[PDB]
Amino acid sequence: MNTVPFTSAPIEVTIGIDQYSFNVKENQPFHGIKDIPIGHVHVIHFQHADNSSMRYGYWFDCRMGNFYIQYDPKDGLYKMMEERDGAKFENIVHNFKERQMMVSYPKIDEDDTWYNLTEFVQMDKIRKIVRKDENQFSYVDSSMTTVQENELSDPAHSLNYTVINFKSREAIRPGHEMEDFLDKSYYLNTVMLQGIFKNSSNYFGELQFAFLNAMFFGNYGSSLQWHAMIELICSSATVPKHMLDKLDEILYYQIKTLPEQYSDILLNERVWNICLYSSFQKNSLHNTEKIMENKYPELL
Amino acid sequence: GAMNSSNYAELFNNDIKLFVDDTNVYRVTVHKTFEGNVATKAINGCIFTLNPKTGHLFLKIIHTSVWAGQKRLSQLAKWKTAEEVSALVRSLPKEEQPKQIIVTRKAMLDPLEVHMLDFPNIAIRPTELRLPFSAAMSIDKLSDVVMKATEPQMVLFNIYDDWLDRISSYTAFSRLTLLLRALKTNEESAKMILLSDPTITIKSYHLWPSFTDEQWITIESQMRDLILTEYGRKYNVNISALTQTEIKDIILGQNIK
Numbered sequence A: 001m002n003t004v005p006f007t008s009a010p011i012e013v014t015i016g017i018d019q020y021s022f023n024v025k026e027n028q029p030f031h032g033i034k035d036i037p038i039g040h041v042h043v044i045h046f047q048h049a050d051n052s053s054m055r056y057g058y059w060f061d062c063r064m065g066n067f068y069i070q071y072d073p074k075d076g077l078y079k080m081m082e083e084r085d086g087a088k089f090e091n092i093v094h095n096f097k098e099r100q101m102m103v104s105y106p107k108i109d110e111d112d113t114w115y116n117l118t119e120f121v122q123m124d125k126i127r128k129i130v131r132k133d134e135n136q137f138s139y140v141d142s143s144m145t146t147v148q149e150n151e152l153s154d155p156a157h158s159l160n161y162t163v164i165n166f167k168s169r170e171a172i173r174p175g176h177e178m179e180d181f182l183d184k185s186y187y188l189n190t191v192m193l194q195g196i197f198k199n200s201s202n203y204f205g206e207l208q209f210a211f212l213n214a215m216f217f218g219n220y221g222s223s224l225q226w227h228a229m230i231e232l233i234c235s236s237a238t239v240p241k242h243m244l245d246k247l248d249e250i251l252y253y254q255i256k257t258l259p260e261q262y263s264d265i266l267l268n269e270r271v272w273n274i275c276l277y278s279s280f281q282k283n284s285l286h287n288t289e290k291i292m293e294n295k296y297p298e299l300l
Numbered sequence B: 001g002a003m004n005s006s007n008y009a010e011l012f013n014n015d016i017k018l019f020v021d022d023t024n025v026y027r028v029t030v031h032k033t034f035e036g037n038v039a040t041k042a043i044n045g046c047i048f049t050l051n052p053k054t055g056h057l058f059l060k061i062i063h064t065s066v067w068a069g070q071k072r073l074s075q076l077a078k079w080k081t082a083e084e085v086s087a088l089v090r091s092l093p094k095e096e097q098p099k100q101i102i103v104t105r106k107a108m109l110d111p112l113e114v115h116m117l118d119f120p121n122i123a124i125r126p127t128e129l130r131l132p133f134s135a136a137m138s139i140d141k142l143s144d145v146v147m148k149a150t151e152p153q154m155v156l157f158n159i160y161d162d163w164l165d166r167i168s169s170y171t172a173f174s175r176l177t178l179l180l181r182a183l184k185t186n187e188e189s190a191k192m193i194l195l196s197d198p199t200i201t202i203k204s205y206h207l208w209p210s211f212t213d214e215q216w217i218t219i220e221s222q223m224r225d226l227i228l229t230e231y232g233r234k235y236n237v238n239i240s241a242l243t244q245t246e247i248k249d250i251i252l253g254q255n256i257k
């Protein structure tokens, strides 16, 4: 288990660590999060108590370095940094642990939730969507736009999700106009999977990452990407059986985790009714259909 | 965006544009089978593609053989229409290609947009006006060429005959749509109006009779009375009681989807 220490907590803030969250009071003796499970990416995120504008946070993997948080009073936010001095870092952590100045990552042993939400997400792929190569961790916030959003404005601060557009020359073979518009299997299997993603695990990773940025930051372009990647599969007549079974599991755990009170801004009614009730795969998503109908029957 | 009454003069400006109507592409008769089931029999159809400024009509005849062995024909028909419009545009010299294509039915928007992805500067637009282009098949010379075709065929017409020598394209389009609305409303009475007088004839190279300016005013009035009469017949309204402002108001409302 690994640790992300905090230099201090000079401003009141709600801190998120994966799907958990806790409040820290202005100048309270908080020096970080311990017992972070090794084996998964994680996200530490923030929402200032005095300015809920800009949710922001950092994706990281404790196997790739020793990271800590320090408040920057000039830029007004909590920043992740890497500590290259290994012996310094261990001694800082051990002191804060001895003084019990850290919250424990509260993982119930029955609970596979975080694994289920991040099964295909890898730090290396995050670092290609979020391009800031001098850091081993990746900053995301509420307002960052996606490449696709910008096409429809600063390019260095953008989310480089794979562009999906059903009415583009990429999606539609000349001469196969009706076929490719009504059945997205070409676009899914040849363009996206064989061409761009190389395999379904990378496709699912980006899908999972998009959901988590939508949920944790309220990032609207990420919510668009998540829905686009679902629709692309559901609107394809020919999908490998293992991808459909895994998609059902992926979506089930995303719908299970979504806060009920955010359903009206995180779920697109058109896309979900289309995917569950009219698409080619309308009958291939049993677990997702059952949780959606029992938890968000209004949306349908 | 969409095309309606506010930006109506745009139809007659110098940006090339085409109306596309797919209502006569897939045409069937429904009938009983020997076993008492119901079956359809297709007949030849046509794509109606019109330049409203010039009157040039590109009539693509849709031969029934194109439906042979195909499924979901009403859906295929939209995509076949979009394919043929796209092929027409590609066949035209660059300086003749349209800047806008206006579809009479909103279901043609995605099929045409997808077929025209290669032409990102051609705007594909719907229209709120109730255009009567389905009555094209009420023009005898057009119906004849469609029903006689034994193979796919494109035929070029000027649907305004020689009217533009005498009137503006705004007026010619108004005349056209009034004639076609009358023909769709009461085809028999409309054709009676147009042909009653034997001394006015249809030139071999024309679609409509050779009316003088004054006779066209008379014909146009008779067509409006025909439509108003049908309006009265349809909704059980006493048209004689109606004021001129009320009649104008009824017409404007009846010409909007």
Ligand SMILES: COc1ccccc1NC(C)(C)C(=O)O
Pocket: B181, B185, B227, B228, B230, B231, B234, B250, B251, B254, B255
């Ligand atoms: C003056 O009435 C109209 C004016 C213009 C178009 C149509 C109508 N009425 C009928 C022919 C009944 C219709 O089909 O709506």
